[PDB]
Enzyme design. Structure first.
Site, PDB file in Angstrom:
ATOM      1  CG  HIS A  21      14.193  16.056  66.219  1.00 26.13           C
ATOM      2  ND1 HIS A  21      13.742  16.506  64.991  1.00 26.13           N
ATOM      3  CD2 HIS A  21      14.404  17.153  66.971  1.00 26.13           C
ATOM      4  CE1 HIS A  21      13.688  17.824  65.014  1.00 26.13           C
ATOM      5  NE2 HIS A  21      14.076  18.233  66.202  1.00 26.13           N
ATOM      6  CG  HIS A  77      17.918  19.642  64.047  1.00 24.78           C
ATOM      7  ND1 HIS A  77      17.981  21.002  64.254  1.00 24.78           N
ATOM      8  CD2 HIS A  77      16.966  19.177  64.875  1.00 24.78           C
ATOM      9  CE1 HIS A  77      17.080  21.349  65.144  1.00 24.78           C
ATOM     10  NE2 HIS A  77      16.466  20.257  65.534  1.00 24.78           N
TER      11      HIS A  77
HETATM   12  C1  LIG Z   1      11.617  23.709  69.223  1.00 26.66           C
HETATM   13  C2  LIG Z   1      12.941  23.842  68.524  1.00 26.66           C
HETATM   14  C3  LIG Z   1      13.100  25.256  67.853  1.00 26.66           C
HETATM   15  C4  LIG Z   1      12.717  26.447  68.436  1.00 26.66           C
HETATM   16  C5  LIG Z   1      12.821  27.676  67.743  1.00 26.66           C
HETATM   17  C6  LIG Z   1      13.356  27.725  66.440  1.00 26.66           C
HETATM   18  C7  LIG Z   1      13.767  26.517  65.849  1.00 26.66           C
HETATM   19  C8  LIG Z   1      14.342  26.201  64.608  1.00 26.66           C
HETATM   20  C9  LIG Z   1      14.683  27.128  63.451  1.00 26.66           C
HETATM   21  C10 LIG Z   1      15.235  28.375  63.676  1.00 26.66           C
HETATM   22  C11 LIG Z   1      15.543  29.206  62.601  1.00 26.66           C
HETATM   23  C12 LIG Z   1      15.249  28.809  61.293  1.00 26.66           C
HETATM   24  C13 LIG Z   1      15.560  29.723  60.095  1.00 26.66           C
HETATM   25  S1  LIG Z   1      17.300  29.445  59.527  1.00 26.66           S
HETATM   26  C14 LIG Z   1      17.381  27.750  58.912  1.00 26.66           C
HETATM   27  O1  LIG Z   1      18.194  29.601  60.675  1.00 26.66           O
HETATM   28  O2  LIG Z   1      17.633  30.329  58.428  1.00 26.66           O
HETATM   29  C15 LIG Z   1      14.647  27.569  61.091  1.00 26.66           C
HETATM   30  F1  LIG Z   1      14.353  27.130  59.871  1.00 26.66           F
HETATM   31  C16 LIG Z   1      14.362  26.740  62.154  1.00 26.66           C
HETATM   32  C17 LIG Z   1      14.519  24.820  64.617  1.00 26.66           C
HETATM   33  C18 LIG Z   1      15.199  23.925  63.657  1.00 26.66           C
HETATM   34  O3  LIG Z   1      16.274  24.405  63.130  1.00 26.66           O
HETATM   35  O4  LIG Z   1      14.871  22.711  63.583  1.00 26.66           O
HETATM   36  N1  LIG Z   1      14.079  24.328  65.747  1.00 26.66           N
HETATM   37  C19 LIG Z   1      13.644  25.315  66.538  1.00 26.66           C
HETATM   38  N2  LIG Z   1      14.020  23.600  69.436  1.00 26.66           N
HETATM   39  C20 LIG Z   1      14.042  23.747  70.809  1.00 26.66           C
HETATM   40  C21 LIG Z   1      15.370  23.388  71.160  1.00 26.66           C
HETATM   41  C22 LIG Z   1      15.865  23.248  72.559  1.00 26.66           C
HETATM   42  N3  LIG Z   1      16.855  24.343  72.817  1.00 26.66           N
HETATM   43  C23 LIG Z   1      17.711  24.104  73.967  1.00 26.66           C
HETATM   44  N4  LIG Z   1      18.602  25.208  74.198  1.00 26.66           N
HETATM   45  N5  LIG Z   1      17.669  23.024  74.644  1.00 26.66           N
HETATM   46  O5  LIG Z   1      16.138  23.067  70.082  1.00 26.66           O
HETATM   47  C24 LIG Z   1      15.323  23.217  68.933  1.00 26.66           C
HETATM   48  O6  LIG Z   1      15.687  22.980  67.829  1.00 26.66           O
HETATM   49 ZN   LIG Z   2      14.718  20.216  66.576  1.00 22.93          ZN
HETATM   50 ZN   LIG Z   3      12.989  21.857  63.951  1.00 26.89          ZN
END
Ligand SMILES: C[C@@H](c1cccc2c(-c3ccc(CS(C)(=O)=O)c(F)c3)c(C(=O)O)[nH]c12)N1C[C@@H](CNC(=N)N)OC1=O
Ligand SMILES: [Zn+2]
Ligand SMILES: [Zn+2]
Length: 230
Positions: free
Chosen positions: A84, A149
């Site tokens: 993605h 996601h």
């Molecule tokens: C680059 C990415 C990103 C940045 C920081 C954290 C994540 C996590 C994460 C957090 C928490 C958990 C633990 S838990 C499951 O909730 O217990 C996890 F396992 C994954 C994931 C995911 O979940 O894939 N991805 C992340 N980014 C930017 C972004 C743009 N943000 C805007 N405001 N435009 O969006 C996004 O996903």
């Molecule tokens: Zn993502």
């Molecule tokens: Zn991610």
């Protein structure tokens, strides 16, 4: 020997983990909005070459990934697929492209990456625009389950090993919420996970986009945490 965890990997280093014959995950860590997170990708042997799934979340991490692959495996990465448009999937595509790797993503991912200012894979993967679509790509199958996601998220199946790489549409068993939902469709996500479950009932290992691999239970757990987040 245990799966490498967030506090065990300094930001900038990459570790590989053998999943099955000719299948590895890659694990790196990155800072985002003042917190540190781990993230996974996949490496699949493709004869005397390698297919890479997802960057290591940043340019320097992805350079370190290529160095770790050279040290541990010693076969050239020739193609990469980003699952993605977020930086944990495409950040490092410019590094890959300068190291001779042909980079691919769906047209939807390429559009979203361009619009948001993330790095842009070179080549478009057609045949994935409707949920339930699947195409072959070297030693893997790419599958579009529907919005989860993100609206563009792809999953990857390695048929030789029954390895299901869910990417960020799939969460680890310890997760307590649906992760970063900025671009998610929480209402459609359970339906998309059900499509994954129905299409890959023989998966033996399931790898989330972040955290520890496990078995098929990761899919149901993901549906549960997403429904409750919503
Ligand atoms: C680059 C990415 C990103 C940045 C920081 C954290 C994540 C996590 C994460 C957090 C928490 C958990 C633990 S838990 C499951 O909730 O217990 C996890 F396992 C994954 C994931 C995911 O979940 O894939 N991805 C992340 N980014 C930017 C972004 C743009 N943000 C805007 N405001 N435009 O969006 C996004 O996903
Ligand atoms: Zn993502
Ligand atoms: Zn991610």
């Amino acid at each position: 020997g245990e799966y490498p965890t967030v506090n065990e990997i300094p930001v900038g280093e990459v570790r590989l983990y053998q999943i099955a014959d000719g299948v590895w995950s890659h694990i790196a860590t990155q800072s985002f909005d003042g917190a540190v997170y781990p993230s996974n990708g996949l490496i699949v042997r493709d004869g005397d070459e390698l297919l890479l799934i997802d960057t290591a979340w940043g340019a320097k991490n992805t350079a370190a990934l290529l160095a770790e692959i050279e040290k541990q495996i010693g076969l050239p990465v020739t193609r990469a697929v980003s699952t993605h448009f977020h930086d944990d999937r495409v950040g490092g595509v410019d590094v890959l492209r300068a190291a001779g790797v042909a980079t691919y993503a769906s047209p939807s991912t390429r559009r979203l990456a361009e619009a948001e200012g993330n790095e842009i894979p070179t080549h478009s993967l057609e045949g994935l625009s409707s949920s339930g679509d699947a195409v072959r790509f070297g030693p893997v199958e790419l599958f579009y389950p529907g919005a989860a996601h993100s609206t563009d998220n792809l999953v990857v199946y390695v048929p030789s090993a029954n390895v299901l790489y869910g990417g960020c549409a799939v969460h680890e068993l310890s997760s307590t919420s649906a992760g970063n939902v900025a671009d998610a469709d929480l209402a459609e996500w359970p339906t998309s996970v059900e499509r994954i479950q129905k299409h890959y009932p023989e998966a033996e290992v399931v790898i989330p986009g972040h955290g520890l691999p496990g078995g098929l239970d990761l899919l149901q757990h993901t549906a549960n945490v997403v429904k409750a987040h919503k």
